[PDB]
């Protein structure tokens, strides 16, 4: 059925993101390792995009379990920096495979735009939920048992997920797609695919510049307590969960172009409002708005990728969702380091204001998605 595939993609994304996050609080126990996974995923996304059109979705969505499970074990038994880096790179390839192949399969199964909206919303809700229950899970287990409890529990969990894969997807038989998909070059030459991918990129780059540089600006102006840095962003996750689980539904009613436009403005007018907050209490509302609007944008531009592909090019979703994932991961690849560097160069408030201005100025470019020609 289709709901089984939806649940399998949801659980895959959830477990992959629990892993990306769980590792965060264990690494201090600092260089390019934090972005190794993201940049490796950015490298290996288009390859899965072209591979899903050559061998099918199952085999390259099941290769997620076989690879992420190896990472979750390699992290469980990591001693040197080289082992940690190769484990994070293997995770990155696993997250690629899972995200690209799973979103492509969700697009190829739910062939109606209205239902594809809700399905992509639910999958991104899986992403958000995994990110939300990640740091808790890891820490709790790290403090109560040791540095190997979270990784072994997630190994068991991805093993169960891979069993569901083997007994639902049946990747035993290779199966090429029905028609030759449009080459990635032509897809990237289109203006509307570029606009949607750019919207997702800019939104996620704003978040990924905010997150690892807000504790820095906090410990020097607010003098917040140690645990305050943890709650300083939990509103963003919770709001992203809410937004990307409800707007996958609300967007096709409101109009995906309008949802994305309003989505980015809200991102802009919230990120711009972060530097004006002086105390942790005043930091909540703009962070909530940031998360809510990032969800507004993501759940509304993820269906529109497959929609534009169905409306303009041939109906093969591997390459276009590889493009959208590249958009995503560009943020968590470049944004953290570049934002830290810019904050050290000019200043964190000016960096957040630049991000906000760029987002508010780029938002009106989403009106071009009101009615694209065929
Ligand atoms: C390991 O270290 C990290 C820890 C964390 C992150 C990245 C890290 O490294 C990369 C991101 C993940 C975000 O979101 C996501 O992954 C998802 N949106 C998907 C679409 C990428 C999240 C955005 C929402 C609050 C709006 C913010 N943080 C949470 C913790």
Curated annotation (Swiss-Prot):
The keyword Disulfide bond applies. Changing residue 238 to A/N: Abolishes serotonin uptake. Changing residue 131 to A: Abolishes binding to dihydrotetrabenazine. Abolishes dopamine uptake. It comes from the Eukaryota. Changing residue 302 to A: Reduces binding to reserpine. Reduces dopamine uptake. It is found in: Cytoplasmic vesicle, Secretory vesicle, Synaptic vesicle membrane; Cytoplasmic vesicle, Secretory vesicle membrane; Cell projection, Axon; Cell projection, Dendrite. Its main location: membrane. Keywords: Cell projection, Cytoplasmic vesicle, Disease variant, Disulfide bond, Dystonia, Glycoprotein, Membrane, Neurotransmitter transport, Parkinsonism, Phosphoprotein, Synapse, Transmembrane, Transmembrane helix, Transport. Changing residue 17 to A: Abolishes binding to reserpine. Reduces binding to dihydrotetrabenazine. Reduces serotonin uptake. Expressed in neuronal and neuroendocrine tissues. Detected in central and peripheral nervous system in particular in axonal and dendritic processes in dopaminergic cells of substantia nigra, histaminergic neuronal cell bodies of substantia nigra and tuberomammillary nucleus, in ganglion cells of sympathetic glia and in peripheral sympathetic nerve terminals in stomach and duodenum (at protein level). Highly expressed in chromaffin cells of the adrenal medulla and histamine-storing enterochromaffin-like cells of oxyntic mucosa (at protein level). Belongs to the major facilitator superfamily. Vesicular transporter family. This is Synaptic vesicular amine transporter. It comes from Homo sapiens.
